[PDB]
Amino acid sequence: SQFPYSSAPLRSVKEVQFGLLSPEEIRAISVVKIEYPEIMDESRQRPREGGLNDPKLGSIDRNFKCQTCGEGMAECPGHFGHMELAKPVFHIGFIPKIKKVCECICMNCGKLLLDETNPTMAQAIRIRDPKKRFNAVWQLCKTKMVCEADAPVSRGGCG
Amino acid sequence: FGEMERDCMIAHGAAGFLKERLMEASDAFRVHVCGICGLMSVIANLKKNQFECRSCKNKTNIYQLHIPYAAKLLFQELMAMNIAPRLYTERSG
Amino acid sequence: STTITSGLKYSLATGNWGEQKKAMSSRAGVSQVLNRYTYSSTLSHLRRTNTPIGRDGKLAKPRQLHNTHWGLVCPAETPEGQACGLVKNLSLLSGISI
Amino acid sequence: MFFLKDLSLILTLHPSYFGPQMNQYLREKLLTDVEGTCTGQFGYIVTVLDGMNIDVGKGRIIPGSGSAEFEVKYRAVVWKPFKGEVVDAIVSNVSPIGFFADVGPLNVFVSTRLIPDNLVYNPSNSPPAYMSNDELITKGSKVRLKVVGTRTDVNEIYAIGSIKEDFLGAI
Amino acid sequence: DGSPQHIINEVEQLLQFHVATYMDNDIAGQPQALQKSGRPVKAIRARLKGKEGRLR
Amino acid sequence: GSEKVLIAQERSAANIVQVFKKAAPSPISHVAEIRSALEKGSRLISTMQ
Amino acid sequence: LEQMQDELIQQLKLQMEESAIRDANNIEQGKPAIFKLKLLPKVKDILLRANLADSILDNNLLASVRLWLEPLPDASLPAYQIQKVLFDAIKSLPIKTSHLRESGLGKVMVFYQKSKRVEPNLKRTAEKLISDWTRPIMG
Amino acid sequence: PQRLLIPTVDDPGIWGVKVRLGKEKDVVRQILKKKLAREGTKNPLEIYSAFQRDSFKGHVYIEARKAEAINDALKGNVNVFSNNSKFLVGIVEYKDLLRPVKSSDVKLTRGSYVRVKNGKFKGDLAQVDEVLENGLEARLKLVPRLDYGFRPAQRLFSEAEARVHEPTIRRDRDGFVTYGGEEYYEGFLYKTFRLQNLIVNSINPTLNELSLFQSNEESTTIDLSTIADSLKETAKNLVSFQPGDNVEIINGELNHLTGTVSSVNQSTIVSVRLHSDDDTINSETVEIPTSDLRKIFNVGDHVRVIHGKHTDDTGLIVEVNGDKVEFISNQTKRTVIVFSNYLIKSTDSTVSINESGRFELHDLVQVNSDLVGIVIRAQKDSFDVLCSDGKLLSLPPVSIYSKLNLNPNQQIAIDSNGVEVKVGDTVREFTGERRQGTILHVYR
Amino acid sequence: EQPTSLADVFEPSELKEKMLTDEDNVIRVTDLPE
Amino acid sequence: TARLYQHSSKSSAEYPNRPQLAKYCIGLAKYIQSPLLEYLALDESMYSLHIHKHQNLLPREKLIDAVQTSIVDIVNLVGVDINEAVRAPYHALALPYVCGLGP
Amino acid sequence: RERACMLCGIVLPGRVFMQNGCPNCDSVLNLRDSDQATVNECTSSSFEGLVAVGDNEHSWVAKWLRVDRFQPGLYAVRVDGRLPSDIVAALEQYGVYYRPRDGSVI
């Protein structure tokens, strides 16, 4: 009863689904594009729009309302902005996994180095847990050091 | 009200007291989540009575939650690192 | 003239024994605020020694009271908790060679 | 277009109403809060079938607030216009920018740019109308129009009609 | 403007370093990003770990 | 305006040979250690094993 | 083995020429060029295979590559996917002076370099490839 | 020739060395002096050339044949860092290291309209009457900002008012007048401004200034070639795409084809799935440059204005006249004709009116000398007011008198029984519909 | 690559506000009170 | 007219470094000097003035036409100097309302 | 204060150009025998890319910049401003073709 009335129904969290954020989703949920390195417009209040302190991102001042939701400081949750990168860069938390995925697939045709014809590969695919499945597939496909343009008939590889 | 006190309250079995200590007597907060994307990206304007999730382009399937402000901060910091924690109010199996 | 002056003043004021821009990895706690709660506390503080072994990789042997400590450090006076045994007080007739 | 739909409503009851007449009170509360409302997702709910024999189930006590929450499932008649649909109407107002018609509870505005050119607006006529040689459409005149666009509001729906194609206009 | 590959490699590697240290400033095998005070930058990863982190 | 006291710092003596026994999980069994320091200034210079 | 690859590459050459002719006629008939897009996946798969490069150079498929890269008489450039795939294939193969003489792709490369409707990245790649191909002639 | 001079394998190599910032030209001059001094000696500096580029900060490039020659050239210099930070430049980079820069425009064009970075006319649109050959400054045509005896609004220099307020005006030619040391030609100021005082790109013109500048040309906006080029630039740069947009192709072999944007990569490559009567073609995705895409706007779609006077206005498409599209507005509820370049298919408006006008929602304002009302809905162009009578009105923000700021000693309510009721209290109607609600404002 | 109508230059609403349309020229030319 | 002038952006452009009360006083002074020109300066906001008790009962077009007729009659009874109108736009506000003429 | 001679590309102080003229271009420009306007029209103080050349004959850079037949010294990669039309015609009279170093022509 300490929160102002909102017509949306009140429910409780039953599931938390994790995952990564696609660039399309990052662009969609954003409200402004950040491009100007200068934090302050002219050091005369009113921080520069399109900068790191854009008023659309949210308000942290008592007398200033958010320009996106219009709520006060006590109610505005903050809104995200997005920054376009000139060249793609690695995510520091996924470099070992990126290396493993590069070891598991071919760098030209973009296909797995092993197929379901191998009984061990089919057995590995049969498992359910994604992490253990990836571990088994990597343990198998690590040894396979050459892409096959023909079936070990063409398997879709480039050789 | 550290972790050991939380464990003692669990041992007593008092779930209501624990919830009240960690929410009402502390950082309680209200957020809106889209019923589709599951993210806290709803642009809610309470005075005008209009809610809208731009990514999913919906105005109806929107719910509100009561979560600790630290949880909201944690989810936003996770989103800052390209991780998307999606909160859903129904199970799927 | 500001170099030496500021360096000495900073190291004595903060206790970090080193350059101001290398505060990390420098030995901290060398300089402390004199304890003036009572006369005995001041006298004890002015005759205190520290063993910079730290907390990481702790062991009981450095903290113990050794046989060779007889007559040179106080067997009874030592702090409680983390610094127990590492902080020593000179005996009442001890000296340090010059 | 009218439809039959199975809808559900979440009803919260204050503890001061925890009496023997709880079920009937929930029924009238549902009727007052659903009959005549306008939801953009569904359109307009006009009536609720079997309004006196609706199952309400068992209400769940909300922890920390005492109030009970009820899940009410019911069948109701719902009307919703669709893009590209031709329906009958009755003109409610005539104006130089266009004329406003009524299709049940929905009020439809048709601009002059969606009206045939021969139906020149006549402000001197009593009442003023959009008239041609053989056609005269004024207040209270039956018109057959095709809904082109629908605008969704908080609890209102705005539709745009047109009479510029064949088998449209005055009827 | 103009593309000497050496300059491009240097600047893109600088960008990669900044983005990486913005999210993790304890990458073993390379020096940390430092503030003008000399203290290491408090990356987002450091916000979440330890007794004083977000979770604990 | 604040009174600061310098706490004496204890360190191992220099210019003395210390022989230590290394633990089993290592090819080294015994180590002879010495740290050198010039008399003028008494500053640590180099260590040898 | 190698002769079978040469036969398959010659069949691909005939298919590419026929598709180019059909697309040119369709454009002349008021219809978009679709046959080149239809054949693009198979051509991409063949070109990405490195061991077939020798057979490609034996059959001089670069002539048909240049034919596809040649702008149609309506002054309309080929689809960006075709240009990108062909540029990637050209980079991926060891083109020599003899192959350029057989195909005459340098003229189209110079046209791409000089043109402005071409993507600037393709412009830079064309400059790089032209410089690389001029490298052996002068030393 | 120029093409034949491209480097070969036997040409002298090029090395780059990191140096301290700002000392590159100093190192170049030192190297040249050392080479000249040791020229004609037993051990001359065996190099060929050395140079640097402003863009490539901290790098000095020397053309030589031996690393020992580089060491000898760098020996005796203090700007070189302690480590031998030298690298072998790739032969392909040889052309790029010396390729020219800033070749986008022959040069600032006389007669073009530009914006001013800084000074008495910061941001005022100015015509480039003269370009100085030095390129650091240029004489410009501006609208004077004078008070004749915090800056005055721009206004054509009026000789009569200037003489009345200051009779010390000078005259040099017919139509060329110098007042207060400033040269005004036929009512327009002509003053030289530094290149560091101008924006020559992304220039945003206004009709008002355009008319004020072109009125003396006996025709409204006649410098139209440059104006047409600016129009093309504004049309090209303002286009932004999103997945699901219906677009049409202008050029290429796929010209005059419709498709839906599937995914967006960077800002120049857009993956599009085409639509056609053939099913096998509709299942293909094509990446197409954005420069050959035109948005397709169907009648009866919610569209929001991107930029212009009607910014943030939404509505439903009614008439599609090719480049210009007509749509019925939502706030003003009237038809507005804006170019298709300024429209985005946004199915939901959710317009926020904050930071606009003087009044917010639920503001008790005075309509006129007699009517007092409260705000029910705010618009980007007007406000909706419910008055004490019970009717609704639409008025511009300017027309409203002012907000009725009332202290609690003024905003007082007394119920039927005489008990005082304050702001925010809940009361129920005694008769009629017998409704209830919270008090928002009390007046009379 | 190489190619005046005031309709394309500025928005029709702005042109009508600034009085630069065909109705404007007809009214100005016409010998009648507005 | 003074209240409406203190909020109009015309005053802000005319006086960029002056307080709102200064603009209000300037509007009062201009009204005393010439009420007709001040009433003309309202442009569209003149229609929101309290003119008649039942002014809102009439349709907007009819009220606008009545205002136009009244102002044209008054300005034609007064007369407009062409030279001063050219010299100052403020005095040129009355030019469109002359008979035969128009905006 | 230094200026870059537009024709040969050498960079020397403007007062040096006025007092002594261009050591290389004096056979066709007569910069010393030219007034300050002509000196500015053939020597520009606004330039970019300082270049020091030691051996014109063997430096590939000098051939690439067409300065292998000139005096070694300070040279500019790009020079702001071009030769005037009258000076261009005068040089064309002498039979010498002028290639601008402004970079806008390539």
Ligand SMILES: [Zn+2]
């Ligand atoms: Zn907000």
Ligand SMILES: [Zn+2]
């Ligand atoms: Zn492969």
Ligand SMILES: [Zn+2]
């Ligand atoms: Zn969503």
Ligand SMILES: [Zn+2]
């Ligand atoms: Zn010269």
